[PDB]
Ligand binder design. Structure first.
Ligand SMILES: *[C@H]1O[C@H](CO)[C@@H](O)[C@H](O)[C@H]1F
Length: 440
C-alpha cells in the first residue's frame, strides 16, 4: 500500500516540447527547429516555436507542480541555449536563465532532476554529421562540463541522455524524428557515438562538479514476449529485445555489445574498439526507466529489421497511441534488478495520451489516465515488495506539449494546455495523483 517516505514524486518535460522562445536570448538552431519547419514532417503543421511558452511561463509550471504536491521536477536543458554553435563559446544568458529557474524550483521545495540531452542537437553539429561523428561525443562532454560547473552547486541528480534508442533509430534509421535520415548503418553509428558521448560526459561531469553528483542515463525499455513458443517466434522476441533493450543495457553494464545482435547486423555494426567500450561503462549512480508499452513479437522475415512485428491484443485497453500493459513494468523492473547491475532505479517517464477536452463544467474528465496511473503504481508496489530498489516516479507529462512528429495533437499532460491562450488547467487525473501522493 505505502511507498517509502522519501520517495521522489514528480512530473517530467523536455525543453523543445515546452519552452518556445526559440530565437530568444541567443538560442541557436536545433535539429528539431529544422525538422519541424520542413513541410510535411509534423502531422498537424505545428512547430515548437511557441509550444507552452515555458521559457517565459516556468513560474506557472512551478505553480502547477506545487498544486499537485510533487517534490521533484524532471526537465531538460536546451544545448542550443548554452552553446548555440554546438561547439564554441558559451552563451552566458542561457546559463543564467536555467540558474534562475533552478533557484525558483528550490525556493518552492522541488528537487530538480536535469536531463542534459533530450534530442535538441545544435544544427551546426548535424551539418558535420551529428551523432554520426565521434566529434559530437567530445563536444557533448564539453557542454556537460559547462553546465555542471554552473548548476552543480544546487543540482545533484543529472541524466546525460534521454532515450538514445530514439535519437539513433528514429532520427537516423527510420527517419521519423529529427534529423530524419534513413540509413541503418548511420543509425548504429549514432547509437555508438551517443553512448560514447554519455561515457565521456560522465567523466567530465565528475571532474567539474563542485560537490558529489548522482549521475544516470534514461532509457526507454520495452518488455518483449514471444507470440508462441515456436523457435521462430522466440527468436523474433530475442531479436527485438536485443534491438531496443540489450543493445544499450549491455555496453553500459560493461558487457560489450550483445554478440547475437552484432552477428545479425553484420557489416552494418559499428567499429567498437575496446577503449570506447571502457568509456561507455563509466559507473552510474542510478538508471532511469521510461516505460510505455510491451512488444508481443511474431517472426516477420519479410519485414524490415529486426524482422519482428507486433501482435496487437484487442482485449487490452488502448490509449490514443499505445497499448496498455501495466504488468510489463513489473517484468522489466524485475529483469533489471535480477540481471543487471544498475541501482537504484527511477521511473523517469510513464503516462498516456488521450483525446482530452474541456467539459461543460470546466474540468477534464480523463478517467482512462487516472486508471493508467493507478494500474502502473500498483505494479511499482509489487516491484518494491520483490526488493527492486526503486526511488521515484515521474509522470509524463506535467502539461500537454509539442509531441514531436505528432505536433500539438497528442496530449500527454496531467494538466491541459490551451495552445491558443497558454492557460493551463489540472485534469482530473492530476487531482487523483495529488490526493494519492498526499496520502503517502
Ligand atoms: C518519452 O515519450 C514521450 C511520449 O512519446 C515523449 O513526449 C518524451 O519526449 C519521451 F522522452
Amino acid at each position: 500500500e505505502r511507498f517509502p517516505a522519501d520517495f521522489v514524486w514528480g512530473a517530467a518535460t523536455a525543453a523543445y516540447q515546452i519552452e518556445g522562445a526559440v530565437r530568444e536570448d541567443g538560442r541557436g538552431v536545433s535539429i528539431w527547429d529544422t525538422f519541424s519547419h520542413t513541410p510535411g514532417k509534423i502531422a498537424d503543421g505545428t512547430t515548437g516555436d511557441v509550444a507552452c511558452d515555458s521559457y517565459h511561463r516556468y513560474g506557472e509550471d512551478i505553480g502547477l507542480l506545487n498544486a499537485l504536491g510533487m517534490n521533484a521536477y524532471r526537465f531538460s536543458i536546451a544545448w542550443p541555449r548554452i552553446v548555440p554553435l554546438g561547439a564554441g563559446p558559451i552563451n552566458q544568458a542561457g546559463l543564467d536563465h536555467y540558474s534562475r529557474m533552478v533557484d525558483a524550483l528550490l525556493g518552492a521545495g522541488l528537487q530538480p532532476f536535469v536531463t542534459l540531452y533530450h534530442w535538441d542537437l545544435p544544427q551546426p553539429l548535424e551539418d558535420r554529421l551529428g551523432w554520426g561523428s565521434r566529434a559530437t561525443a567530445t563536444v557533448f562532454a564539453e557542454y556537460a562540463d559547462i553546465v555542471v560547473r554552473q548548476l552543480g552547486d544546487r543540482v545533484t541528480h543529472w541524466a546525460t541522455l534521454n532515450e538514445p534508442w530514439c535519437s539513433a533509430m528514429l532520427g537516423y534509421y527510420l527517419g521519423v524524428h529529427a534529423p530524419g535520415h534513413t540509413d541503418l548503418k548511420r543509425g548504429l553509428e549514432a547509437s555508438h557515438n551517443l553512448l560514447l558521448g554519455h561515457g565521456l560526459a560522465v567523466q567530465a561531469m565528475r571532474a567539474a562538479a563542485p560537490q558529489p553528483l548522482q549521475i544516470g542515463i534514461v532509457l526507454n525499455l520495452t518488455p518483449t514476449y514471444p507470440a508462441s513458443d515456436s523457435p521462430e517466434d522466440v527468436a523474433a522476441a530475442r531479436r527485438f529485445d536485443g534491438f531496443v533493450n540489450r543493445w544499450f543495457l549491455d555496453p553500459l553494464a560493461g558487457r560489450g555489445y550483445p554478440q547475437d545482435m552484432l552477428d545479425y547486423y553484420g557489416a552494418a555494426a559499428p567499429q567498437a574498439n575496446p577503449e570506447d567500450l571502457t568509456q561507455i561503462a563509466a559507473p552510474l549512480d542510478w538508471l532511469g526507466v521510461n516505460y510505455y508499452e510491451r512488444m508481443r513479437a511474431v517472426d516477420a522475415p519479410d519485414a524490415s529489421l529486426p524482422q519482428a512485428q507486433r501482435l496487437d491484443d484487442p482485449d487490452l485497453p488502448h490509449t490514443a497511441d499505445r497499448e496498455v500493459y501495466p504488468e510489463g513494468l513489473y517484468d522489466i523492473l524485475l529483469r533489471l534488478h535480477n540481471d543487471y547491475p544498475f541501482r537504484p532505479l527511477y521511473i523517469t517517464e510513464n503516462g498516456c495520451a488521450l483525446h482530452d477536452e474541456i467539459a461543460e463544467d470546466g474540468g477534464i474528465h480523463d478517467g482512462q489516465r487516472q486508471a493508467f496511473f493507478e494500474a502502473h503504481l500498483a505494479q511499482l508496489q509489487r516491484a518494491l515488495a520483490a526488493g527492486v530498489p526503486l526511488k521515484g516516479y515521474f509522470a509524463w507529462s506535467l502539461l500537454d506539449n509539442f509531441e514531436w512528429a505528432m505536433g500539438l495533437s497528442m496530449r500527454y499532460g496531467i494538466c491541459y494546455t490551451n495552445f491558443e491562450t497558454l492557460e493551463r488547467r489540472i485534469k482530473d487525473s492530476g487531482y487523483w495523483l495529488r490526493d494519492f501522493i498526499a496520502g503517502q
